[PDB]
Amino acid sequence: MLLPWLILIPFIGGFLCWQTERFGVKVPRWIALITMGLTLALSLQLWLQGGYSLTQSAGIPQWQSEFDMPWIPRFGISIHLAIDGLSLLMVVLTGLLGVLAVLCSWKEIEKYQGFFHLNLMWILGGVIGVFLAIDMFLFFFFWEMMLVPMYFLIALWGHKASDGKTRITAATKFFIYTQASGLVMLIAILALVFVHYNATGVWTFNYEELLNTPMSSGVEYLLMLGFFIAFAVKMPVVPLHGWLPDAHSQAPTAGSVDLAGILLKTAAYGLLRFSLPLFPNASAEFAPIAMWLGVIGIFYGAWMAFAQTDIKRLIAYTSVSHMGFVLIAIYTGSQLAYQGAVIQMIAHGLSAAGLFILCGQLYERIHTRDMRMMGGLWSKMKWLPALSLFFAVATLGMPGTGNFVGEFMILFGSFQVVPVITVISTFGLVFASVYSLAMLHRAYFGKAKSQIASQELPGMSLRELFMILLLVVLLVLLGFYPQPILDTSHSAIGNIQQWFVNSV
Amino acid sequence: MIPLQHGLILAAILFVLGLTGLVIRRNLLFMLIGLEIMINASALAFVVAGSYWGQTDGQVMYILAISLAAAEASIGLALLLQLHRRRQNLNIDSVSEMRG
Amino acid sequence: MTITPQNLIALLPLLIVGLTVVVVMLSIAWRRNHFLNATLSVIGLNAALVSLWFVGQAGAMDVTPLMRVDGFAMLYTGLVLLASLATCTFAYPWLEGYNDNKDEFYLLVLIAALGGILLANANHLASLFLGIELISLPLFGLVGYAFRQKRSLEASIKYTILSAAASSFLLFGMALVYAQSGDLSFVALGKNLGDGMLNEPLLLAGFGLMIVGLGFKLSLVPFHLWTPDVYQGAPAPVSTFLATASKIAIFGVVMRLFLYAPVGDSEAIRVVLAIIAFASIIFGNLMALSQTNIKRLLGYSSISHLGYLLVALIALQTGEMSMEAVGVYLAGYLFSSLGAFGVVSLMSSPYRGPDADSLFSYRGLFWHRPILAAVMTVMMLSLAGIPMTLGFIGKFYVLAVGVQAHLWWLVGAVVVGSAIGLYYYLRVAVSLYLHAPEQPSNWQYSAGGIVVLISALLVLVLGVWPQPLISIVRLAMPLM
Amino acid sequence: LLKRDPLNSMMNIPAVLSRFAGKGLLLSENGYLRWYVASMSIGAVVVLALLMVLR
Numbered sequence A: 001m002l003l004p005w006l007i008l009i010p011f012i013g014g015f016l017c018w019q020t021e022r023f024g025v026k027v028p029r030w031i032a033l034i035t036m037g038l039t040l041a042l043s044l045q046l047w048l049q050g051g052y053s054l055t056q057s058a059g060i061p062q063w064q065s066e067f068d069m070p071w072i073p074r075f076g077i078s079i080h081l082a083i084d085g086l087s088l089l090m091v092v093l094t095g096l097l098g099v100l101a102v103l104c105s106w107k108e109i110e111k112y113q114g115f116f117h118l119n120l121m122w123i124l125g126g127v128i129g130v131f132l133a134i135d136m137f138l139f140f141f142f143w144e145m146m147l148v149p150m151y152f153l154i155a156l157w158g159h160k161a162s163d164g165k166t167r168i169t170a171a172t173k174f175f176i177y178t179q180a181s182g183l184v185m186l187i188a189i190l191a192l193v194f195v196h197y198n199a200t201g202v203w204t205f206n207y208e209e210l211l212n213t214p215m216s217s218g219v220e221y222l223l224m225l226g227f228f229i230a231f232a233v234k235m236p237v238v239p240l241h242g243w244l245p246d247a248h249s250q251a252p253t254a255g256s257v258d259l260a261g262i263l264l265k266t267a268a269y270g271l272l273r274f275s276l277p278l279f280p281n282a283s284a285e286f287a288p289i290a291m292w293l294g295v296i297g298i299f300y301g302a303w304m305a306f307a308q309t310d311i312k313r314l315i316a317y318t319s320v321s322h323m324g325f326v327l328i329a330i331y332t333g334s335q336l337a338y339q340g341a342v343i344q345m346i347a348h349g350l351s352a353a354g355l356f357i358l359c360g361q362l363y364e365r366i367h368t369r370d371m372r373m374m375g376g377l378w379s380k381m382k383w384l385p386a387l388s389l390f391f392a393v394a395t396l397g398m399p400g401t402g403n404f405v406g407e408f409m410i411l412f413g414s415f416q417v418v419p420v421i422t423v424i425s426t427f428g429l430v431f432a433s434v435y436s437l438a439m440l441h442r443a444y445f446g447k448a449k450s451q452i453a454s455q456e457l458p459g460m461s462l463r464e465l466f467m468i469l470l471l472v473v474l475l476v477l478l479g480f481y482p483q484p485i486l487d488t489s490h491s492a493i494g495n496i497q498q499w500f501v502n503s504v
Numbered sequence B: 001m002i003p004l005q006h007g008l009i010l011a012a013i014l015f016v017l018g019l020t021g022l023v024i025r026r027n028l029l030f031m032l033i034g035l036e037i038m039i040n041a042s043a044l045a046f047v048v049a050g051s052y053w054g055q056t057d058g059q060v061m062y063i064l065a066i067s068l069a070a071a072e073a074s075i076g077l078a079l080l081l082q083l084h085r086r087r088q089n090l091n092i093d094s095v096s097e098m099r100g
Numbered sequence C: 001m002t003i004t005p006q007n008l009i010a011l012l013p014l015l016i017v018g019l020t021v022v023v024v025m026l027s028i029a030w031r032r033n034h035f036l037n038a039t040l041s042v043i044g045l046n047a048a049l050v051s052l053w054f055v056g057q058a059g060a061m062d063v064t065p066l067m068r069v070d071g072f073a074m075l076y077t078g079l080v081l082l083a084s085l086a087t088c089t090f091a092y093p094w095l096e097g098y099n100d101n102k103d104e105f106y107l108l109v110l111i112a113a114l115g116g117i118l119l120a121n122a123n124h125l126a127s128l129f130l131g132i133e134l135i136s137l138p139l140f141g142l143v144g145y146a147f148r149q150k151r152s153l154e155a156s157i158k159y160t161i162l163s164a165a166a167s168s169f170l171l172f173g174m175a176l177v178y179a180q181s182g183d184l185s186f187v188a189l190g191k192n193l194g195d196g197m198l199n200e201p202l203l204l205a206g207f208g209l210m211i212v213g214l215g216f217k218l219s220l221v222p223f224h225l226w227t228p229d230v231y232q233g234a235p236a237p238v239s240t241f242l243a244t245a246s247k248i249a250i251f252g253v254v255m256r257l258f259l260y261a262p263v264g265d266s267e268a269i270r271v272v273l274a275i276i277a278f279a280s281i282i283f284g285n286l287m288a289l290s291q292t293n294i295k296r297l298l299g300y301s302s303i304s305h306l307g308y309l310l311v312a313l314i315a316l317q318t319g320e321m322s323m324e325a326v327g328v329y330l331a332g333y334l335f336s337s338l339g340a341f342g343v344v345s346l347m348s349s350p351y352r353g354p355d356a357d358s359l360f361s362y363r364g365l366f367w368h369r370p371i372l373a374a375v376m377t378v379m380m381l382s383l384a385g386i387p388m389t390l391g392f393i394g395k396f397y398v399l400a401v402g403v404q405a406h407l408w409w410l411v412g413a414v415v416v417g418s419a420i421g422l423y424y425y426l427r428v429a430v431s432l433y434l435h436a437p438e439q440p441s442n443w444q445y446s447a448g449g450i451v452v453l454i455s456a457l458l459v460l461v462l463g464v465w466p467q468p469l470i471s472i473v474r475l476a477m478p479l480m
Numbered sequence D: 001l002l003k004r005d006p007l008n009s010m011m012n013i014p015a016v017l018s019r020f021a022g023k024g025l026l027l028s029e030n031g032y033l034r035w036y037v038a039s040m041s042i043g044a045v046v047v048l049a050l051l052m053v054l055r
């Protein structure tokens, strides 16, 4: 009953951010702050009242909360939301990152700031809707819902130092990739619904009824491939990754845009919720190809991140490699690897959010993004290079941060299932250390390679320092005490895994 | 004792000749003339079809066809007069400013 | 058969539009007045909508050997009437800028609407041919209404010559079909065949020549090359009418013809129409890629969208929701094209004379026309099939229809063409909000703005909540 | 060797093919009415031949 409000509070908040711009130009940032605060507080209350640590696995369907309302009764389409542990963790994560995105866009007050905030809130509400929707048409609708505010954020409010045409090019590349993949997913959804209708005779887009739909191996493989292509563009999975560094480089220079739209992983959750249960045999036969695609993604993302002269492109390719790890984890049959994948998703969200925020602050201070135009910035800036050192250490895979817990539980489960791919992925961890040290050496250590680098730069203010330190504390606590997260996601992960391994 | 095939073949011959005149002629007046040959061939085909079946519908189709031919001939000749008055030239290739 | 009083009350939109044509003509003859004659035309069209309500209160029946009135006829009549009313509303400020006579515009719009109503009710080859011609000839006048302007005269000449050729092709194909089948009614085109002999060579050839004429009229490949020229050169309200009402009415009569004719389920015609649909989708989307002209872009857009509709037509004899998909998609396409061509019409109004340029210059439109920019970007999203818009609902219907009928090449064509559409539609929608260096006050201009804003609100609301439109189109059922 | 993303290029070549095919198809829109009539007659020949072949 709170899930409709979990989606509607961002949308009403964005409408109010647009509407209360007339009383002041410093007002819409406030209204955005309250609406993401209430969204985060509602998600936290759903965590507190859910009792996710005590609930046991009983098989799909098993939702801690549910909501249904008919939307298009001709096709059997309803606004059908449901929440369990995995969805709850993703919703709490996107609420926290939405609050951090509102905080990151602070002190940036100009005309049509309310429209920026409205686009931000609509992106975040669409992300929450993808995490909550458990009927296929509403899931697809929310899937394509975020991309229009995302497109207008990249194209209109993007990197102000760009030509103006490159921002439009990156936004168009991102939109075309994501929407063509979504359309292929819609073809798969439609064909699955028609197969179910030919089997039974009733229209349903509900995911619970579409489970155990009798179909042949070729048809199931094709439907799984359509779903996988949609989830592979947005994960990203190589070679469908090309939109990501260009969208990150041309995104609004605060980096709040990255946190709100580009950095959350609806694709891994989509694979876990709708690929493995809906098509278990097809996912079982597709597992070698997807695991090798994940291996290639790890090493390709590492080699790309090492070759970048741009910080933002570097961090985007770090995201590519870590999602290669998650893609290997998803197609195993291991509960341990799935729990590691959940921890990895949360920790990569936190760590990449910190990295992108710190890069935005660094660009604000030095007005350039070329690593060859700076050096020895440790001696010039008070707080930023040490926190950037911590976040490079976190994305490196260091114990004490949640990234290590995620990667290593993934690798333990994967080695129980597939040893060779696990070995190659650990050498991927070596490559990750290589690019993290390369970024640290090129940016903050050495001598100044330009005149702007050899100047005393102003320190971080209290708000941005406090949000960075909150991210640091959350990453350290996730590294040392990841048990509440595992207890939250345990029942959902057990349901997904027991469905996937018992039907093959 | 006339086959329907012979009347239909004659109508097809006239339609093909009118279309050839519409394509190969660069003067707009001769394009309009070929259009009249085409629509008259279509009306002849309808009359042949109606006279085979012994029905009045073929001549009614002819009547509607020649009503269209009259009205579209008047419109085409008004446009031809406007083109001649605006450009002093009946070239259909010269009126080509709009292009991809 | 004769015409009963029941046949008269079913004939009500046609009678009201014909009486409006006569009344408007007599008012023109009494004195040349722009405002009162525009008012009389729009009053006649609104009375025709209420007449459609009264027709709906009556039953579905065959008013002539020629006409058949059912919920299908009522729906497509309503679509044609809405497009005509919007064309009159857009036409008034543009004609207020005009210098010559500005009431024959409304006379031609009314006669073209009469042809649209006839095509909505057409159950015969007679009424099909006559409705096509009654659409075409007033559009010959309307496309070249500003004949002193070079582009309008050129578009008039091109449309007139090519539509005369297409009507010759359609008439010859009709004659060949009538030579094979002794009756001209839609239900009888192929009744005198059996034991798998539906593929009679003369019936197929006649239907092919009719396909040539109808595919000219629907801008289907390879009879599409006229579309960007006539769309760019014509007056902007004429572009609105030619984009909406002509295509809607002709595609509706093509629906009824292929639904009723026993040769409509021929495999050869299905394969030929599948080829035309594939080529139309791909070619229109590919050709709108590099267009700086908004009207040519919308012309190639119409080519692609009619290809999507033709895909929905191919599955008419296999699936069940083909007519439903065509109705929903046609309502959405009507409202999208009304909004887009209305923004183009309002920014080109009043008329600036035959010598002055009529360029849209959509770049930076938001900084001086914000509401028009919002309406135009809603249309650009809707024509791209973006969810939260009614164009996506139509695209979803087309995809479901193709998936049911196992038309996989057509479904892949829709996906590829939709991606290309995303490129050029988003290019226009984001150029609306950039910055441009350099480059009303009456209630009719405000009425046109109200029309495009209501179209935007309809597209958004029925994209979010499409159930009322689906319910309306579902009860508009033709005779089985 | 990989510093300029090769996978991005081999996924961007459909856009290059789309632009090339669109520019090639725009050659038919030369604006000549006689070519438009010729194209309609060519399409008529193609449609009729397809109907006779497929039957």
Ligand SMILES: CCCCCCCCCCCCCCCCCC(=O)OC[C@H](COP(=O)(O)OCCN)OC(=O)CCCCCCCCCCCCCCCCC
Binding pocket: A216, A217, A218, A219, A221, A222, A225, A228, A229, A232, A237, A238, A239, A240, C412, C416, D014, D017, D018
């Ligand atoms: C403008 C130009 C550029 C744009 C356009 C470019 C081209 C676009 C179109 C690309 C896709 C082409 C069509 C792919 C689907 C082919 C389907 C097919 O051949 O199905 C045959 C068969 C059907 O199964 P059936 O035999 O009926 O099952 C019952 C008993 N077995 O199927 C089977 O039995 C199963 C077959 C499975 C494998 C076929 C699909 C291959 C897909 C390759 C791409 C994805 C690769 C993996 C993911 C990569 C990373 C995301």
Ligand SMILES: CCCCCCCCCCCCCCCCCC(=O)OC[C@H](COP(=O)(O)OCCN)OC(=O)CCCCCCCCCCCCCCCCC
Binding pocket: C049, C050, C052, C053, C054, C056, C057, C058, C059, C060, C070, C071, C072, C074, C075, C078, C079, C082, C331, C451, C454, C455, C458, C468, C469, C472, C475, C476, C477
């Ligand atoms: C709201 C969402 C958007 C909708 C967009 C619609 C666009 C097209 C507008 C016209 C559509 C007309 C469709 C009519 C279908 C009717 C089918 C039918 O069979 O209806 C039967 C019903 C009476 O029921 P029954 O008892 O069965 O009658 C027969 C018994 N002898 O009879 C009826 O129900 C009668 C129906 C009368 C319709 C009158 C319409 C008046 C004009 C309405 C315009 C709305 C504004 C749209 C544009 C806004 C501006 C851009």
Ligand SMILES: CCCCCCCCCCCCCCCCCC(=O)OC[C@H](COP(=O)(O)OCCN)OC(=O)CCCCCCCCCCCCCCCCC
Binding pocket: A184, A187, A188, A191, A195, A198, A214, A215, A216, A219, A222, A223, A225, A226, A229, C406, C408, C409, C411, C412, C415, C416
């Ligand atoms: C560019 C992107 C778009 C690409 C083009 C669009 C998708 C093309 C898919 C090609 C499918 C080929 C199918 C070949 C056999 C068809 C005839 C047949 O026998 O089908 C089997 C079956 C119908 O037979 P029935 O007796 O009803 O059995 C029901 C239970 N199967 O059939 C059914 O029940 C339904 C069969 C559904 C087939 C798959 C539909 C979804 C496809 C997902 C996306 C495409 C594949 C992955 C991506 C490729 C690369 C882009």
Ligand SMILES: CCCCCCCCCCCCCCCCCC(=O)OC[C@H](COP(=O)(O)OCCN)OC(=O)CCCCCCCCCCCCCCCCC
Binding pocket: A169, A172, A173, A176, A177, A178, A180, A181, A229, A233, A239, A240, C289, C415, C416, C419, C420, C423, D011, D012, D014, D015, D016, D018, D019
């Ligand atoms: C790995 C294989 C299996 C998985 C396949 C999955 C397919 C769906 C998801 C991937 C889609 C990839 C799309 C790649 C192109 C993205 C569009 C793009 O790059 O746009 C930017 C570009 C404009 O930039 P610029 O080059 O500066 O402009 C010159 C003109 N002024 O724009 C242009 O230059 C023009 C853009 C034209 C329209 C977009 C391109 C459409 C191409 C077909 C789309 C469907 C593809 C189907 C599969 C193809 C084979 C993989």
Ligand SMILES: CCCCCCCCCCCCCCCCCCCC
Binding pocket: A111, A112, A115, A156, A157, C366, C374, C377, C378, C381, C433, C460
């Ligand atoms: C719900 C409708 C979604 C699609 C329509 C989008 C248009 C919404 C209304 C207009 C928004 C204008 C935003 C302009 C921002 C310009 C910023 C310039 C300075 C950075």
Ligand SMILES: CCCCCCCCCCCCCCCCCCCC
Binding pocket: C282, C408, C409, C411, C412, C413, C416
């Ligand atoms: C230039 C643009 C080209 C776009 C082409 C789009 C093609 C999409 C993929 C079509 C795949 C069709 C597969 C048909 C399989 C039929 C199997 C029948 C078995 C009896």
